[PDB]
Amino acid sequence: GDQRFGDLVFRQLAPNVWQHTSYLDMPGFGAVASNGLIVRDGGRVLVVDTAWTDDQTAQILNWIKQEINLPVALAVVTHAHQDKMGGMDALHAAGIATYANALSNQLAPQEGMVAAQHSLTFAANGWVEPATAPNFGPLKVFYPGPGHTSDNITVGIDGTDIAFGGCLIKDSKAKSLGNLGDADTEHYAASARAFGAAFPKASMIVMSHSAPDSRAAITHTARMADKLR
Ligand SMILES: [O-]
Ligand SMILES: [Zn+2]
Ligand SMILES: [Zn+2]
Numbered sequence: 207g208d209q210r211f212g213d214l215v216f217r218q219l220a221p222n223v224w225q226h227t228s229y230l231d232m233p234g235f236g237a238v239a240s241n242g243l244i245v246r247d248g249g250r251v252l253v254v255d256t257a258w259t260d261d262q263t264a265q266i267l268n269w270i271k272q273e274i275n276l277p278v279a280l281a282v283v284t285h286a287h288q289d290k291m292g293g294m295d296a297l298h299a300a301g302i303a304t305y306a307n308a309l310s311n312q313l314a315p316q317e318g319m320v321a322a323q324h325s326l327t328f329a330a331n332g333w334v335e336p337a338t339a340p341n342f343g344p345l346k347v348f349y350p351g352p353g354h355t356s357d358n359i360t361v362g363i364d365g366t367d368i369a370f371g372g373c374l375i376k377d378s379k380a381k382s383l384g385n386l387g388d389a390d391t392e393h394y395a396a397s398a399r400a401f402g403a404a405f406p407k408a409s410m411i412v413m414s415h416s417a418p419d420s421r422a423a424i425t426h427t428a429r430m431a432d433k434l435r
Pocket of ligand 2: 285287354355373385
């Protein structure tokens with residue numbers, strides 16, 4: 207069951223995997239939820255995405271201290287929007303090593319974000335170049351192509367049935383793709399399908415702006431994105 211912890215919500219998804227949820231009251235758009243992940247890998251914790259703010263991200267770290275009580279070895283953030291990178295300073299203040307797509311780090315300042323410390327680069331086929339993601343343990347990072355943004359990346363969790371689509375994927379009941387302000391409308395559908403093809407065994411799809419769903423999230427997202435072309 208959901209655990210309310212201050213203004214955030216935490217939900218266990220699998221034995222070593224939790225979803226974090228934070229909210230930003232965006233005037234004209236309501237209070238928008240954003241989800242990321244927390245993964246225990248043996249004696250350390252790995253984080254996918256910040257919360258919207260530094261204060262909220264510090265609260266994620268407080269929850270981790272309370273409920274897991276192991277060091278956070280690293281965080282990876284999945285593009286240069288506030289829901290994913292807004293809390294970078296809190297991660298740095300805590301001494302956590304941070305990683306993002308090279309392109310996300312390049313875009314960060316202009317998007318009003320602080321860059322991660324380290325840049326991921328990607329092979330032509332989309333898989334992260336392993337030397338740029340040292341000590342990622344079960345996190346398998348994949349660049350599916352431009353979609354929600356040019357820089358969006360995705361993360362599978364080895365040893366689980368879970369893959370994280372970030373803001374690229376919406377659930378199977380969604381009426382729209384959400385914020386397309388920085389989207390690549392021509393390539394979105396193919397990128398959504400490439401995410402699915404990269405993690406073919408994942409039966410639980412986690413995403414930023416919907417609750418976890420089946421792979422119907424991927425097919426429905428791609429089918430909606432077909433209409434953008
Ligand atoms: O976003
Ligand atoms: Zn975004
Ligand atoms: Zn988002």
